[PDB]
Symmetry: C2
Subunit: 29 residues, 2 copies
């Protein structure tokens, strides 16, 4: 899985949010 901004890529589903290095990200798997 990956933390992404602004959205997941094709095939992936968002499962909440990452808190990483002072930013918020979509958690995508």
């Amino acid at each position: 899985c990956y933390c992404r901004i602004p959205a997941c890529i094709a095939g992936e589903r968002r499962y909440x949010t990452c808190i990483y290095q002072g930013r918020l990200w979509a958690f995508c798997c």
Copy 2:
């Protein structure tokens, strides 16, 4: 990378936190 409760697995590094389903997770890579 993965979001895990209660902790990352040995070999992984905790890079931050996830929020998903009203819970706090370790963000592990």
